[PDB]
C-alpha cells in the first residue's frame, strides 16, 4: 500500500533547478545531508535531558556513511529524532514551502546552490548527485516509513517492512552515472574533512568489502 503525493509547485520547481543547472561543486550535498542528521541529532539529545526514556529506541547518536559501489548508492544514517508521518506528508512540506520560495528569491539575487542549507532545504541538494532518493525514517511517536523521489513532480509515502531500525534516518542516494566519485573512499573523507570538520557527532565511514 503506497500513496503518492504531488510536490508543491514551488518545490518542485526547485527540485527541476537543482538537476538541471549545470554546477560542478556537487560535493556540498554532503555537508547539507549531515547537517541535517546533526540537526536531527541535536533533538533528540535535548528530549532525553528530561526524559532518558527517549533514548530508550537507542541511546548512541552517529552518524553513519556508507558506499555501495555494487548497488551505486551512498547511504547516510543518522540516529536523530526521526520523522512522523505528519512530517513526511504536512510538517517538513510546510517548512519546505518558505524556505524554497526564499531560497529562489536569494537565487536570482545573486546567491548560488552553495548557499541552500541557509534556508532549511538542504535536503533537496541529494539530487546534485541522486536521481532517486530513498528515506526510511523511524520516530519515537510514530511507525518506520519510507519516502521515495525520483523528482519529477511526485514522491510516495509507505510503511517501512524492512530491516528495523529503532529511531533515526536513513537517506539512500542512488547517485547518477557521472557521479560515483562520491562511492570512493578517500573522496568521501576529503568531503568530511572540508565541510563537515565539526559536527558535534561521531561520523563513522564504513569502507567496503
Ligand atoms: N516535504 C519534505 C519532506 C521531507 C523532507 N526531508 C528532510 N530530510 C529528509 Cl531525510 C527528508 Cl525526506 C524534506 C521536505
Ligand atoms: N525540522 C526540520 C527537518 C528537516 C528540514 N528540512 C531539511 N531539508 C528540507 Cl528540504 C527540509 Cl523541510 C526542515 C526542518
Redesign the pocket.
Given at each position: 500500500e503506497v500513496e503518492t503525493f504531488a510536490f508543491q509547485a514551488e518545490?518542485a520547481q526547485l527540485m527541476s533547478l537543482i538537476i538541471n543547472t549545470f554546477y560542478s561543486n556537487k560535493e556540498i550535498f554532503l555537508r547539507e545531508?549531515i547537517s541535517?542528521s546533526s540537526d536531527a541529532l541535536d533533538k533528540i539529545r535535548y528530549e532525553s535531558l528530561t526524559d532518558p526514556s527517549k533514548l530508550d529506541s537507542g541511546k548512541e547518536l552517529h552518524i553513519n556513511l556508507i558506499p555501495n559501489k555494487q548497488d551505486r548508492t551512498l547511504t547516510i544514517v543518522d540516529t536523530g529524532i526521526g520523522?512522523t508521518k505528519a512530517?513526511?506528508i504536512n510538517n517538513?512540506?510546510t517548512?519546505?514551502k518558505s524556505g524554497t520560495k526564499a531560497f529562489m528569491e536569494a537565487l536570482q539575487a545573486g546567491a548560488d546552490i552553495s548557499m541552500i542549507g541557509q534556508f532549511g532545504?538542504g535536503?533537496?541538494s541529494a539530487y546534485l548527485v541522486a536521481e532517486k532518493?530513498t528515506?526510511i525514517?523511524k520516530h519515537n511517536d510514530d511507525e518506520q516509513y519510507a519516502?521515495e523521489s525520483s523528482a519529477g513532480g511526485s514522491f510516495t509515502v509507505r510503511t517501512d517492512t524492512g530491516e528495523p531500525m529503532g529511531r533515526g534516518?536513513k537517506?539512500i542516494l542512488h547517485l547518477k552515472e557521472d557521479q560515483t566519485e562520491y562511492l570512493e573512499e578517500r573522496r568521501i573523507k576529503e568531503i568530511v574533512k572540508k565541510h563537515s570538520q565539526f559536527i558535534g557527532y561521531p561520523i563513522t565511514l564504513f569502507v567496503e568489502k
Open positions: 518545490i545531508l541535517n520523522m512530517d513526511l517538513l512540506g517548512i519546505a532545504v535536503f533537496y532518493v528515506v525514517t519516502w534516518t537517506v
